[PDB]
Design an enzyme around this catalytic site. Structure first.
Site, PDB file in Angstrom:
ATOM      1  CG  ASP A 106     -96.815   1.736  80.194  1.00 30.63           C
ATOM      2  OD1 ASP A 106     -95.586   1.662  80.427  1.00 30.63           O
ATOM      3  OD2 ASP A 106     -97.523   0.750  79.908  1.00 30.63           O
ATOM      4  CE1 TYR A 136     -90.707  -0.175  74.917  1.00 32.78           C
ATOM      5  CE2 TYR A 136     -90.958   2.201  74.576  1.00 32.78           C
ATOM      6  CZ  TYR A 136     -91.508   0.953  74.795  1.00 32.78           C
ATOM      7  OH  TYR A 136     -92.872   0.857  74.863  1.00 32.78           O
TER       8      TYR A 136
END
Ligand SMILES: *[C@@H]1O[C@H](CO)[C@@H](O[C@@H]2O[C@H](CO)[C@@H](O[C@@H]3O[C@H](CO[C@H]4O[C@H](CO)[C@@H](O)[C@H](O)[C@@H]4O)[C@@H](O)[C@H](O[C@H]4O[C@H](CO)[C@@H](O)[C@H](O)[C@@H]4O[C@H]4O[C@H](CO)[C@@H](O)[C@H](O)[C@@H]4O[C@H]4O[C@H](CO)[C@@H](O)[C@H](O)[C@@H]4O)[C@@H]3O)[C@H](O)[C@H]2NC(C)=O)[C@H](O)[C@H]1NC(C)=O
Ligand SMILES: *[C@@H]1O[C@H](CO)[C@@H](O[C@@H]2O[C@H](CO)[C@@H](O[C@@H]3O[C@H](CO[C@H]4O[C@H](CO)[C@@H](O)[C@H](O)[C@@H]4O)[C@@H](O)[C@H](O[C@H]4O[C@H](CO)[C@@H](O)[C@H](O)[C@@H]4O[C@H]4O[C@H](CO)[C@@H](O)[C@H](O)[C@@H]4O[C@H]4O[C@H](CO)[C@@H](O)[C@H](O)[C@@H]4O)[C@@H]3O)[C@H](O)[C@H]2NC(C)=O)[C@H](O)[C@H]1NC(C)=O
Ligand SMILES: *[C@@H]1O[C@H](CO)[C@@H](O[C@@H]2O[C@H](CO)[C@@H](O[C@@H]3O[C@H](CO[C@H]4O[C@H](CO)[C@@H](O)[C@H](O)[C@@H]4O)[C@@H](O)[C@H](O[C@H]4O[C@H](CO)[C@@H](O)[C@H](O)[C@@H]4O[C@H]4O[C@H](CO)[C@@H](O)[C@H](O)[C@@H]4O[C@H]4O[C@H](CO)[C@@H](O)[C@H](O)[C@@H]4O)[C@@H]3O)[C@H](O)[C@H]2NC(C)=O)[C@H](O)[C@H]1NC(C)=O
Ligand SMILES: *[C@@H]1O[C@H](CO)[C@@H](O[C@@H]2O[C@H](CO)[C@@H](O[C@@H]3O[C@H](CO[C@H]4O[C@H](CO)[C@@H](O)[C@H](O)[C@@H]4O)[C@@H](O)[C@H](O[C@H]4O[C@H](CO)[C@@H](O)[C@H](O)[C@@H]4O[C@H]4O[C@H](CO)[C@@H](O)[C@H](O)[C@@H]4O[C@H]4O[C@H](CO)[C@@H](O)[C@H](O)[C@@H]4O)[C@@H]3O)[C@H](O)[C@H]2NC(C)=O)[C@H](O)[C@H]1NC(C)=O
Ligand SMILES: *[C@@H]1O[C@H](CO)[C@@H](O[C@@H]2O[C@H](CO)[C@@H](O)[C@H](O)[C@H]2NC(C)=O)[C@H](O)[C@H]1NC(C)=O
Ligand SMILES: *[C@@H]1O[C@H](CO)[C@@H](O[C@@H]2O[C@H](CO)[C@@H](O)[C@H](O)[C@H]2NC(C)=O)[C@H](O)[C@H]1NC(C)=O
Ligand SMILES: *[C@@H]1O[C@H](CO)[C@@H](O[C@@H]2O[C@H](CO)[C@@H](O)[C@H](O)[C@H]2NC(C)=O)[C@H](O)[C@H]1NC(C)=O
Ligand SMILES: *[C@@H]1O[C@H](CO)[C@@H](O[C@@H]2O[C@H](CO)[C@@H](O)[C@H](O)[C@H]2NC(C)=O)[C@H](O)[C@H]1NC(C)=O
Ligand code: NAG
Ligand code: NAG
Ligand code: NAG
Ligand code: CA
Ligand code: CA
Ligand code: CA
Ligand code: CA
Ligand code: CA
Lengths: 388, 388, 388, 388
Positions: free
Chosen positions: D70, D324
């Site tokens: 990430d 997401y």
């Protein structure tokens, strides 16, 4: 600025000059060109661009395998600069879907994309690059539209849609949009028995659409729209010079209000300019496949059931692949008349060329000349062997 | 805004400084660069760009095979940002064809592309990015034009065309266009015996074109045009410093009104700035091939049959490939005079380098300096071996 | 609009925040990224962009072999959008050459490129994207300039050039340009013994340049220019915190008017912000190679020969390659002060990484913050092994 | 022009129509598409664009290996034209970092990027494409923000940040920015026990954010902000229709002020439109993984602890990967109401598809329709096998 009004008549068509050609398949053999089909051309007041339904993959990409299929969630209406190829980097997405139309009203552009499964499709009408209206399928059987530009007059932009069977009567509707909103819609009337993929143009406050009768006719249905009264009529081109594909051989007399028989459940999107003696018909050379392309001057083709050619121009040799063809004009050009234009989709790959696993196309387009110009043929130009 | 008027004279040329270079072949060895030839440079009031005839394929692409050929349906006039290479993604198509010219009149740009088979070609004149006029072949033998920019004065943009034989008398015409429309055309007059590929520039309301006599002359024909009276004259550069290629060795005295003999049916597009003592001639170094390039100050070359060089500047070494060369100027620059500029096409591939199957080029361009600048040579820079 | 005037002083630098990073080498491993070196950053009133000297080839291209060389005919000053990599398709060529500078005066931009062989180079000054002035080499030995942005005040943009030896006294000149024209030039004066590659910034009507003494000094020479009087002075940063590379270890006392000895004929372009207690020095971490990069707050470094660091921020770890570094600021930002910014060239390839045959770089850049921000290190990020 | 004010209420949501889809992974299999994750959509007054956190490498590039991580120095917030893929050539970098938000206030855009090591991160707030404010980490544990657009009202743009533990109480702050400057900040109040990745929208001068309780809740926390008073409240969606992932099965009664238990330390960014009976909740179909996606009309979900679905629409089949999801609206569209929109990140690669070494995604987005439209499913569409 102000909404465009179809105040001019067509220029006299004495021949066709080269307008645009992208050589997409040739170039895409070694560059990031999107796989497409169902292309067309459409102008804004300050620019004219190429349009098509992308397949969401490059031609050289592994996902090109299977692009013979017409509808998927990976398709979208894209536009790109005139004569450039549709590349990943220069293609602008207008909307998502597998059937479309688009036209500028003089102030801004309306684009329409239909997406969905066969039994649950829906159209979304975009105006000024924003979604404004949505229309759900009414017959639950492949809601579909023009695949070429619509035309506007004083802000009113009529669009022809069809939902239902491709091999029997269906439900065709004419929608009159203004700023992406529905002012009115009518069911198809007149003598056309089946309508699909209308190619339209406008002149002197009237919009003429040459469509395709997939069900029965080898002659083409025609819808003439009054965008002010918001009414229309329909018939078939009377001429014995048959313009669908496949089709039977040309007879000596055609049909004005019925499909000319001989070939069922098949056809190809096509077009024509019906303007009295200034009438020109486009068609594939082959009566059996999407091969070759020619323009034929057939005076009074729409209304004369014995009309035959008085002049012609070959666009693509019968030894080269063609495909869909449609009309468009630059309504914002200088001069006293609208110059008739058209494009021909040059299909490559499946099903005719099955050594490759993809199906795509390139575009060639011409506009009329008042001169009597010499003619050249305009093939796609790619060598399939290179793709193997 | 307003039409540009050729009100200034040329700046004094004391040397040449580097203006633009795209390194197209080097870069294209590993990027999506279009194959081209017949390049040039042309300015708009707010930008100067590179132009050329694309071959409708990338250099690394398999369709690059065969690009030695000059005319096909896959060519188009393209323009792209100064010094960038002509890529698939940044190249703007001006029109479709295999012979062209283009120039900005101060308000907008006129581009001309000729396409067709050899016996049935036609020119289409575009203005403000729209087709306006079409001219059919008059001699049915490769209608062709400048291959470099035209020049305008008060909206009038003269263009030189030739149709007919390349090895005997042909029919050359000077067209005076305004807003893409034909105001008038004349047949070639004067003593030039054959005209092809004119390189032009304008100063003090006069347009000078240095062309090529493919038939007989190794000295260059010159056409001087009055864009107001819309009349012209023609002769040859008098100087013994011969500037075509191939050509015989330089004599001590040249010819003012006849082709200087020694080499028939061949030549190369070239240019010159004829301005009294401020006269500079460009030419290949080799008398046998398109090799090397040099600029020679030859005072009064146009009118003095014994004029010889007083200064010079090497542009490309004789051990490097050159090609076509032409003139252009930024008519919208600041200052009191027009700065003379030129480009040299650096041809790579066939026929000289036949280990590859393609033919392309890169561009180098210079403009004049009133300083006496040091000189460098400017080759294409690519290693053919890399392409094998 | 109007010429920009250096009316503000510098903002208080309490730390450095990340401004831009292009990850060029990482990305270029699999995309059309041009090989470059000598990068910098420069702002226009409406946009800030990355700049660098292209090598006229992509990194993956076969012509990348040999790009360790500094000067060739294939180099050019290019600019591209902030934080994007320099690609073939988004890079704008400003001018052709192997040494450059560029700056916006508030109305338009001036770009300068020097090209030529070592003994016959010349600079061409472009203004508003047109060539305006040319300057021939005065010492016939690698005419060269800043390699980072120049700065303007009321239309006057001073630029430092050097011509002559790199290992002995040379001829450095300060040119004051206005609209691309030479208003005046001076020979270098003051105590700086040798000048190369000046990094400049402006504040309160004064322009400060931190340069490099390639000949003898490991401390950096500084030139302070008055753009109104068009005069300057020169000295060395007095501080014992030495900032060239290679360099000896830091002493306890530096030199204000002589080069600090220990390393001859070598160095690297670098910079500093000299503003009393608000003084920050950039430098490689290694004293031996272009490795690592750190910013050190050294109050009164310019004038205090015993000044040492009071704060610091690591920019690149000593285990990562760095390179040139220079200053720039957005003179068109909002606020009451100019925010100091800088870039670090992250060199990859030769000579340090010789398993590949090319030399290129990526860019990282920071600007000051009045906050005391946490620090991260910012390496190039590419794995050389991938290129093998 | 003038700052936008949230004067309209939401349009009635009777179904969802297709808005945009980029097919990034399909296309990127054979073109220069950047690897991304954490995408979103955000509009300017004249254009709507796709946004995401690049990984600083193409998908086919060797540096794609390891992109499951990430945070790195190679990430940046990029934006690109609606429905195009994020390519190296069309992606615009907004700022550098691994966590972001962005929103247009009607005059210009504010973008925020957080970068740094885990214990020393910092946010930099950009306004009008320039860095204006910086905020240092306050809890030294992954300072992080929305990952979807913020919303503005009269120039005030609230943003939710979190710093500290992901599996225990953390320090969440609401910042009220205006022209990139901090007008005020508050600590989180209300009953939400943990906040991360808020998805927000505005209507009738109120901003609603549906976030994620990574620590304990499978029901979603909601923050309602008053941008005029610059105050807020927080609670959880009362509904038993649980919308985080992973999550337990739906109960018959939910929790309004406490996390609904069953799953700890995990979750996914998500959203909802809470508007009385016009309430729609998005969620993954699977209760175990980021698989599938559906919209459920749950009248009064926010305040009714027994609310259950009355209508629904499948967006992505449970046999397809999701990820997401967040909210955005075109606050500059015509009409009397704001049309609710959302996007779903379609994650491909690691950890679910580990035969490849990368992790990326494509984007699909929808907006509401007042019609009751037929539904289609919208998968990423790429075949992982092709990448092997
Ligand atoms: C340089 O450039 C110029 C400009 O382009 C070139 O000149 C052009 O040359 C063209 C080719 O000759 C010419 O095109 C033809 O025009 C004919 C009409 O003109 C003639 O008739 C009129 C009327 O009497 C006279 O006034 C005139 O003087 C001429 O005599 C058309 O009839 C031609 O089309 C028909 O032939 C072509 C094949 O050439 C078919 O493909 C086409 O479909 C037409 O024929 C079919 O259809 C008709 C109608 O039903 C049938 O009767 C006929 O049997 C054919 O039917 C079969 O084939 C079709 C199609 O496959 C199938 O569906 C059906 O079932 C049957 O199987 C043709 O259009 C241009 O007009 C002419 N232009 C000008 C300005 O002069 C010049 O040659 C070039 N120079 C050089 C050196 O090359
Ligand atoms: C740093 O930079 C500066 C600036 O560039 C460099 O200085 C320049 O140096 C150049 C090279 O020396 C020089 O160029 C030459 O200029 C000559 C003219 O100047 C001389 O004569 C005049 C007149 O008397 C004097 O005033 C002056 O003082 C000089 O003495 C030209 O004559 C040169 O061109 C001829 O030579 C070259 C080869 O060098 C040929 O390629 C060219 O075609 C010319 O010669 C052919 O043509 C003539 C005319 O017909 C024939 O007579 C001759 O025999 C040749 O013919 C053969 O070759 C041609 C071509 O292949 C073929 O077609 C024919 O059939 C025959 O086979 C040359 O142009 C610059 O003027 C000078 N510039 C300045 C400002 O000083 C400086 O050197 C550089 N410094 C360093 C350290 O390198
Ligand atoms: C979260 O983020 C924050 C913000 O970044 C982090 O806090 C920062 O931490 C930094 C690292 O500690 C710190 O940087 C150092 O600042 C020192 C100055 O502060 C100290 O001294 C002053 C003055 O007395 C005090 O006020 C203050 O309280 C401190 O005590 C600098 O001196 C440091 O630079 C020197 O050390 C580094 C190695 O750390 C060298 O690379 C650097 O070159 C400096 O040392 C060389 O040069 C000096 C001067 O000549 C020599 O004396 C010395 O011996 C070294 O010389 C050798 O090495 C050089 C270079 O290789 C060579 O040329 C020479 O010949 C010799 O071989 C350093 O800059 C920040 O200021 C601090 N920031 C803030 C706001 O607090 C925090 O840690 C992070 N948190 C976490 C959890 O990680
Ligand atoms: C053409 O297009 C149209 C338009 O899209 C199509 O028509 C649509 O068809 C949809 C599918 O049938 C339909 O969607 C469903 O709507 C239901 C609500 O309507 C019904 O109930 C109301 C209220 O009584 C009535 O008014 C109405 O008449 C209907 O009878 C929803 O309840 C559905 O969602 C639930 O089912 C789906 C599976 O279908 C689950 O994925 C979803 O999560 C919901 O069920 C879970 O959650 C509830 C609440 O807690 C639980 O009770 C239930 O047991 C499920 O729980 C399990 O699963 C979840 C998720 O995995 C897990 O978390 C939990 O722990 C449990 O394991 C569904 O949304 C549209 O409304 C309808 N639209 C319209 C306008 O009509 C038409 O079919 C298409 N035509 C063709 C030919 O295909
Ligand atoms: C097309 O026709 C309409 C008239 O039907 C023109 O619209 C008028 O334009 C002027 C200036 O905008 C207004 O004051 C009138 O009220 C407008 N409309 C109507 C509907 O009356 C329109 O300008 C025409 N388009 C062009 C390009 O002339
Ligand atoms: C080039 O010359 C023509 C004059 O021949 C200029 O044209 C005049 O311009 C003004 C302003 O547009 C008009 O009022 C005159 O009537 C124009 N034309 C003619 C033909 O008389 C033109 O402006 C000149 N171009 C420039 C850049 O000054
Ligand atoms: C920078 O300083 C100069 C003054 O030296 C400003 O120039 C004046 O600007 C006004 C408006 O353009 C003119 O009427 C004056 O004559 C200008 N110049 C001079 C040299 O006197 C300039 O505007 C200043 N720049 C800015 C951005 O304010
Ligand atoms: C949003 O609301 C504010 C009022 O709060 C509007 O701002 C006023 O705009 C006019 C014209 O710019 C000014 O003369 C007022 O002073 C402005 N502001 C204030 C804060 O009083 C703003 O125009 C509204 N936005 C829109 C699009 O109408
Ligand atoms: C190019 O075309 C020629 C002529 O058709 C053919 O023989 C040759 O092999 C081709 N070269 C390549 C590399 O394909
Ligand atoms: C690069 O050039 C050198 C020197 O010419 C040559 O020996 C070397 O093999 C080249 N490397 C590659 C990969 O081509
Ligand atoms: C990716 O990186 C891992 C971990 O370093 C390495 O073992 C693996 O082989 C790499 N995969 C590829 C295709 O390079
Ligand atoms: Ca049919
Ligand atoms: Ca490639
Ligand atoms: Ca000749
Ligand atoms: Ca040194
Ligand atoms: Ca959770």
């Amino acid at each position: 600025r102000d909404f465009n009004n179809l105040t001019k008549g067509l220029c006299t068509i004495n021949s066709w000059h080269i307008y645009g050609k992208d050589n997409a398949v040739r170039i895409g053999e070694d560059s990031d060109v999107l796989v497409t089909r169902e292309p067309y051309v459409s102008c804004d007041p300050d620019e004219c661009r190429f349009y098509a339904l992308s397949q969401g993959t490059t031609i050289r990409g592994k996902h090109s395998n299977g692009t013979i299929h017409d509808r998927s969630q990976y398709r979208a209406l894209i536009s790109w600069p005139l004569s450039s190829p549709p590349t990943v980097y220069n293609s602008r997405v207008e909307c998502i879907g597998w059937s479309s139309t688009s036209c500028h009203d003089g102030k801004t552009r309306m684009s329409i994309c239909i997406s969905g499964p066969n039994n649950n499709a829906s159209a979304v009408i975009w105006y000024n690059r924003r979604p404004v209206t949505e229309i759900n399928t009414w017959a639950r059987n492949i809601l579909r539209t023009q695949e070429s530009e619509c035309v506007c007059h004083n802000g009113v932009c009529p669009v022809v849609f069809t939902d239902g069977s491709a091999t029997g009567p269906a439900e065709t509707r004419i929608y009159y949009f203004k700023e992406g909103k529905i002012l009115k819609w009518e069911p198809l009337a007149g003598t056309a028995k089946h309508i699909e993929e209308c190619s339209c143009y406008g002149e002197r406050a009237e919009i003429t659409c040459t469509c395709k009768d997939n069900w029965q006719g080898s002659n083409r249905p025609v819808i003439r729209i009054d965008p002010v009264a918001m009414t229309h009529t329909s018939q078939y081109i009377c001429s014995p010079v048959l313009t669908d594909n496949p089709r039977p051989n040309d007879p000596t007399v055609g049909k004005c209000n019925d499909p000319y028989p001989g070939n069922n459940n098949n056809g190809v999107k096509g077009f024509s300019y019906l303007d009295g003696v200034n009438t020109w018909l486009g068609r594939t050379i082959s009566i059996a496949s999407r091969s070759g392309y020619e323009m034929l001057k057939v005076p009074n083709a729409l209304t004369d059931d014995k009309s035959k050619p008085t002049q012609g121009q070959t666009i693509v040799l019968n030894t080269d692949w063609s495909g869909y063809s449609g009309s468009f004009m630059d309504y914002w050009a200088e001069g006293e008349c609208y110059r008739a234009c058209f494009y021909v989709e040059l299909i490559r790959g499946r099903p005719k060329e099955d050594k490759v696993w993809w199906t795509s196309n390139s575009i060639v387009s011409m506009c009329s000349s008042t001169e009597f110009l010499g003619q050249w043929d305009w093939p796609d130009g790619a060598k399939i062997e290179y793709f193997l």
